[PDB]
Amino acid sequence: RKQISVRGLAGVENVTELKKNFNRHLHFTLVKDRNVATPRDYYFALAHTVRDHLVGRWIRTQQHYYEKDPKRIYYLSLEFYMGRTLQNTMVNLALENACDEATYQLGLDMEELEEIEEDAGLGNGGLGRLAACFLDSMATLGLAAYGYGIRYEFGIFNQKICGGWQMEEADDWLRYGNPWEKARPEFTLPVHFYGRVEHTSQGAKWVDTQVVLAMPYDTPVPGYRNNVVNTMRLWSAKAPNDGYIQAVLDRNLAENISRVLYPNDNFFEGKELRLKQEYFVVAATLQDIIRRFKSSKNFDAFPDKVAIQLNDTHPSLAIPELMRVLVDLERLDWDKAWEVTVKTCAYTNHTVLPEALERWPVHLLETLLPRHLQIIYEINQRFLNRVAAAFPGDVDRLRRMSLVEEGAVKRINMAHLCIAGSHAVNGVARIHSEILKKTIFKDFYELEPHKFQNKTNGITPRRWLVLCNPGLAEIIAERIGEEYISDLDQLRKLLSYVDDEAFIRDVAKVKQENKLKFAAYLEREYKVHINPNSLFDVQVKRIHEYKRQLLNCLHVITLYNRIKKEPNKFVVPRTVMIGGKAAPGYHMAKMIIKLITAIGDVVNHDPVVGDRLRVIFLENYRVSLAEKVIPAADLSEQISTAGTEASGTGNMKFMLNGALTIGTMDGANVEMAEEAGEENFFIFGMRVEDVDRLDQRGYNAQEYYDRIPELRQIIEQLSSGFFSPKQPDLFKDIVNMLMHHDRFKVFADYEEYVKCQERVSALYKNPREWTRMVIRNIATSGKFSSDRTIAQYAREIWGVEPSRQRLP
Amino acid sequence: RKQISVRGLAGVENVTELKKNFNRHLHFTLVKDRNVATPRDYYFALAHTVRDHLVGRWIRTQQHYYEKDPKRIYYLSLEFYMGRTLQNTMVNLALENACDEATYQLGLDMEELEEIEEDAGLGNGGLGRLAACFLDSMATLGLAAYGYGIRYEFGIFNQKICGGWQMEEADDWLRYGNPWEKARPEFTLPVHFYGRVEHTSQGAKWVDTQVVLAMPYDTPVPGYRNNVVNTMRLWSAKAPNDGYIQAVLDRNLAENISRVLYPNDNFFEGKELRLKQEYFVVAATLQDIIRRFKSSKNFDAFPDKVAIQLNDTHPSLAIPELMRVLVDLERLDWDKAWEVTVKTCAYTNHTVLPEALERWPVHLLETLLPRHLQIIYEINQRFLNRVAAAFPGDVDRLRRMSLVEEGAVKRINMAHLCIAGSHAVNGVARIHSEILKKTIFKDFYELEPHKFQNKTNGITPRRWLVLCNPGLAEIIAERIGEEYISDLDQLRKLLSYVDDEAFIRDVAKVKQENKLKFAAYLEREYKVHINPNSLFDVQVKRIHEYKRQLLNCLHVITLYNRIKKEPNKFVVPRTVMIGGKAAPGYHMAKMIIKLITAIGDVVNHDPVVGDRLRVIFLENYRVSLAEKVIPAADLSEQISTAGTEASGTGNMKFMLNGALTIGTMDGANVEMAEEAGEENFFIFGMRVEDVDRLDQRGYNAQEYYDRIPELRQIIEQLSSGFFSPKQPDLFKDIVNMLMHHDRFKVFADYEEYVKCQERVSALYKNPREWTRMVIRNIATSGKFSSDRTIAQYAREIWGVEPSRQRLP
Numbered sequence A, B: 001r002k003q004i005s006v007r008g009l010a011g012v013e014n015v016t017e018l019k020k021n022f023n024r025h026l027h028f029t030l031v032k033d034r035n036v037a038t039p040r041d042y043y044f045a046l047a048h049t050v051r052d053h054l055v056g057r058w059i060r061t062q063q064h065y066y067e068k069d070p071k072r073i074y075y076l077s078l079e080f081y082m083g084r085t086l087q088n089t090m091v092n093l094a095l096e097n098a099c100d101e102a103t104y105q106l107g108l109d110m111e112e113l114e115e116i117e118e119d120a121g122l123g124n125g126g127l128g129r130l131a132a133c134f135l136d137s138m139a140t141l142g143l144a145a146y147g148y149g150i151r152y153e154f155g156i157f158n159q160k161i162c163g164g165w166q167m168e169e170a171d172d173w174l175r176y177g178n179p180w181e182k183a184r185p186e187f188t189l190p191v192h193f194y195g196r197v198e199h200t201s202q203g204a205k206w207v208d209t210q211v212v213l214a215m216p217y218d219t220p221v222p223g224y225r226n227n228v229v230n231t232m233r234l235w236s237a238k239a240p241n242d243g244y245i246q247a248v249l250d251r252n253l254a255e256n257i258s259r260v261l262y263p264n265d266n267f268f269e270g271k272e273l274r275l276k277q278e279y280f281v282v283a284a285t286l287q288d289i290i291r292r293f294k295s296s297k298n299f300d301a302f303p304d305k306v307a308i309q310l311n312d313t314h315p316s317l318a319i320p321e322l323m324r325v326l327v328d329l330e331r332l333d334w335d336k337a338w339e340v341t342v343k344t345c346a347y348t349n350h351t352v353l354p355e356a357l358e359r360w361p362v363h364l365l366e367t368l369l370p371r372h373l374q375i376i377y378e379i380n381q382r383f384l385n386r387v388a389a390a391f392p393g394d395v396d397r398l399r400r401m402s403l404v405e406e407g408a409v410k411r412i413n414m415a416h417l418c419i420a421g422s423h424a425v426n427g428v429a430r431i432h433s434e435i436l437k438k439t440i441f442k443d444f445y446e447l448e449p450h451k452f453q454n455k456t457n458g459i460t461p462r463r464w465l466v467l468c469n470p471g472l473a474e475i476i477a478e479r480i481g482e483e484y485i486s487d488l489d490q491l492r493k494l495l496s497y498v499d500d501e502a503f504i505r506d507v508a509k510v511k512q513e514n515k516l517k518f519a520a521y522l523e524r525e526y527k528v529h530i531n532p533n534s535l536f537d538v539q540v541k542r543i544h545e546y547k548r549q550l551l552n553c554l555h556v557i558t559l560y561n562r563i564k565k566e567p568n569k570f571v572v573p574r575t576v577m578i579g580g581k582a583a584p585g586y587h588m589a590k591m592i593i594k595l596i597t598a599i600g601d602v603v604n605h606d607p608v609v610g611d612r613l614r615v616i617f618l619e620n621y622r623v624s625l626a627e628k629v630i631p632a633a634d635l636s637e638q639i640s641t642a643g644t645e646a647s648g649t650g651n652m653k654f655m656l657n658g659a660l661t662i663g664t665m666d667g668a669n670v671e672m673a674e675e676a677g678e679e680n681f682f683i684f685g686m687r688v689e690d691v692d693r694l695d696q697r698g699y700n701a702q703e704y705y706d707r708i709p710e711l712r713q714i715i716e717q718l719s720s721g722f723f724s725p726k727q728p729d730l731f732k733d734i735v736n737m738l739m740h741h742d743r744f745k746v747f748a749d750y751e752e753y754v755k756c757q758e759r760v761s762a763l764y765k766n767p768r769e770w771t772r773m774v775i776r777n778i779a780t781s782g783k784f785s786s787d788r789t790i791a792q793y794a795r796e797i798w799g800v801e802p803s804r805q806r807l808p
Ligand SMILES: Cc1ccc(C2C[C@]3(ON2)O[C@H](CO)[C@@H](O)[C@H](O)[C@H]3O)cc1
Pocket: A124, A125, A126, A127, A128, A130, A264, A265, A266, A312, A350, A351, A356, A428, A457, A645, A646, A647, A648, A649, A667
């Protein structure tokens, strides 16, 4: 517990001070005594005590940026999936052992206190979590970086499983308050909606608007032991200052802008409220940017002092908004303003799936943001003039590249707007960034090849190793010291220990400890028992057809059927865990969750199977749960159809935490296998080239059904009601999709998947060799530190040099 | 400034500690430095520093009540008009001089900082402010007392005057946070709405309800230098824990219950939302009461340990709610439960005006609170059985006394419910309590004479003398010491100084200082100039026909016309100030405000008048403004039609602060004149007997018009458009009401009022004799301390003995 050296020192005066301040907060802040005080009160007492340690560095860091005047990095995102903050703050400030000792002396278990904290679940999954890892890495790399987003009152819904179905409940994360944020009502700014354009004497003027106020809440973002504390600023919607009762109640309408995170992360829903959220962040943020620029030492120097990073197209309105401010308010000529805008803005693309692309109807933009639509049209005209000059007579190219899409509903393609208005465009993994240049944005790449870049995603080894897996962090540090924590490529040193008996022992010991603890978690919180002597086979990620939880389902049923066919034949015991939230309006994803639980209903109660195979659906998968289950995982399921997962980041988390990966050559899986050597990955299935070949001739699921007896059995089980005896036709939609409308070719990878899984089991039967392959994975996970990713953004896009230098 | 002894000591270590903690809060709490810190930041730094001094006493006081186990007093009100808290806290903790010195040493003006604080304007006027004074007095008298109400997100609207008209804006009092309250989300309770009654095995059961959560916020209530800190608990509406987006947005509906204070304090608006607010407070509060009772040592002892005071009929649902809990949940027999309920509950009545009485349609109660309606009917049946037994054959009495009113819309008379369910019923001034027994509740008085009491209202001499008028507080203390501050009857000692040259000098000096300061306030905040050498003639109170701002208007115009008729004739210069908010839906009150400003538009710009007469409308009259204008007042206008103002409390504030009173024999005016001697009051107009005689024969305004040339002139000025030349018919509604539909007989008191005002001017011409009469008023204001009022409630209704004893 305290023996772990990576968790810092418990200095005698530090422990004494922490105890004093803990008690001070319990009294003055919480207004409690030890008589009535609950564990929650004790959590808050510790939270306030720890938060106090950020203040000096937070003030000094921001003062330092004012004095040193570096280029400022503005990271705009509609999602920040931050998780809990208590442990992270302690780790980054080297206070973990000290607080652990302080709380122990007060008769309290700090780990019990940590479990009281709610996730800041202000994101859906990978994209939101990437933003969070990026904030962490930017602070650790000493960048003058500012995360900007919306302070949703309700984050991603809490998932309940009831009767085997997902139920959504409001994530009331602010119920007991947020001790980490600092409300800044004094820095509230006006955001304008609707209205009309007057073109007059000085030029265009946006008038008759409805105002929604944006109140900032600032949250400290500590770097790893470098005394740097950056800021995440999240905007909250407030009704403007100036019958009666109804008028006061109607203030809720404006304030609804920041009420709730949209949970659909796979399908573009052209909801006006989402458009308002996006403009809300953009308008308020850019006001801050402009104000700060003016208070630093004429807009020629703007791109030298400002970088705006667009996390997907969600904040794409930053482009016309910056143009609007520069042209209409600052009175710059269009050409100069555009030069400035392009040099300021860069765009990160996160998916190739067409249904996810933001394409706003022009009528909606005209009504809500009339001036922005005007500006977008002018941008388009000038951009297409450039295309026409570069490719004279290529009319189809003009049509393909246009920001305006011409159908029954005329729309603005926000990706096209982003490319046009950005000096850099990046994908999030090598395979993804390459397909961007090759197909998706081929025309844009040909126009401006220098624009297109790759920035392979990463994860922070603070949250995703030191916090969640201190036991693994410790055994690593015992061999190679602590430098790896902010220099993850040093993990390659561990390759020298592939034959080290002590290290093999310790890697395996740590995994088993994590497995026991997670088993203890499921027993404590859900009264669910799992076999500790089973392979922990884990697929955790949002529920999507492309991620192919359905393929996992087919395999699980295969394992079940094989046991039933040959009950005497030994098989490696497995606990198959699948978790993740479905978008509320995504019927198939909700059916998939029900299928997982239904498979469990049969498998988990078959006396012939017993503890040889168990299938569990992990309820309410979220950042805090990922921190628990990933360190306990033996097998990481990364089984998206080749070409569909832009990068993935869960994959990296598993690799860092001592799990072996079964996966397709998709997203960052490709680079993970390259880093480790393919011999150390369970790679299976179609490559992108194979998927394309199938698309060329037409995907016929019937062929696979007709040729694979074991698949046929499963589909007939699903259709006949074997997994839903009380409602035989329950899974008809799943069967129909698989047989006739499967965009993701589940059947096409079935045989290779099952055979690959056989090899997983074969290796697990050899504990020594399993662990040696694990060492080969952990040792080569260094590339997937978000420090590496951010250093690349800094040097290749932002034009700033990262620094691990400690502030005084 | 600091020289004022009543403001305490500036101890060297105390000043040092305050400065240290001020700086500590600026750093750790506000996350600011002296470079970016605003006056608002400095206010908050001081607020947190001062608030820290309450914590120990707050915890110890509540612990003391647990140990000593006294009878608990629960004061239920839909209104708490608290005002600002910073100065009050400092005064009650003897920290004012210390903080003044501390802030001075830091280079800050504490008075400038105090002006930053928003009023907690969670009330309309007198009733809400009475609750606030009561909380203060109960703490000062060492009572285990608990104020319970609703934490409105928006209090009484901020009043803007635009084009001479009232405009309403949301009172966003929580914009920058409330440093005084402590959120207690852990003690959140469920409140139930709608649903239906099941009568089953154990009995009745309220089922299928919609739940709204009640989250308590606790605010410290410091007693005057007795180390007692009581609690005001205000409930905030929260949506219960368990398409999707719309469902999250719809949480606003439940949360609207605590959104805004209903601003109509003169007309019963049977709004369902108001009914929900009333039940919301009642249900949550009574849950607290029951829980606390059970955690103290079977319901026979309930009335020995619990008193519930109903501030008017607004929390009247406490009666059927307590019955519901006792019968349905605690399983007591009806008779015993009723015995307990009556002994627990007492009712304070605040008006005789019929349109203000709460009479809820039975259909509305059946839908929202079906079980309560059932209980009300049973209460009524049993109560009327008692009436029938006491007055056999008196069928009309039964009809008159029934809780059920039988018209086209069947209604429950909430006053009748209160009388039936309470062991004590009190009016708020001797005249008012007497009319209750004589007419309004005559039948109830005859049934149970012992039930009916008087508790003449009062005001706290902390807020209303020591805080708002330290200069007057000081000159008093110089002669008689500081005991009077919590023993106001000691002011009678000042009668010994009616011929004391030094005291006459000082009383007059203090008044002039206050007048200069208020003149400075109007110049600073509104660029409005007032004549400092003029009589400050002030009518501040909510705008109602019964309060007769219109009568004041007639007098002002009379003064103007008299000047114009005889420009060479000296008149005592006057600044006539009228301020107060009109209920948004009260057309006549809004017209009256416009008339006041319109009169000013003419008078204030007539070169013949100049500074001899000025009429100003004081914008946004509220507690903080009352604290400024009342100490500056020379003449207090208390001119309600006899029988219409139940008590008044503004009257008392003026008397305490060195103003002479012009008023009718109405409400507490009668007792104020009795205390001081009528020779020291400007009493005029019809008594209640005269109003009744007019009602008997019929009020004909035409007679007064026909007989009074000067009145005729004014009405013709109003009708012809003299005060609205651009819209001649603007005031037609006012004229029509005065001439034909005046319930309050403005014309009937016109002649006596004008003649009484002549005598006011005559005395003001004699500064010595004015000041001597002032001394006679201040010296006899002691009865009107809310300490006296609360001591009476304690001894005569609650059965507890007050104590000025200091806690350790
Ligand atoms: C509205 C929305 C929300 C989330 C997402 C994504 C895209 C994605 O995960 N969530 O971004 C991650 C970070 O770059 C990638 O690792 C995932 O492959 C990608 O699907 C897209 C669109």
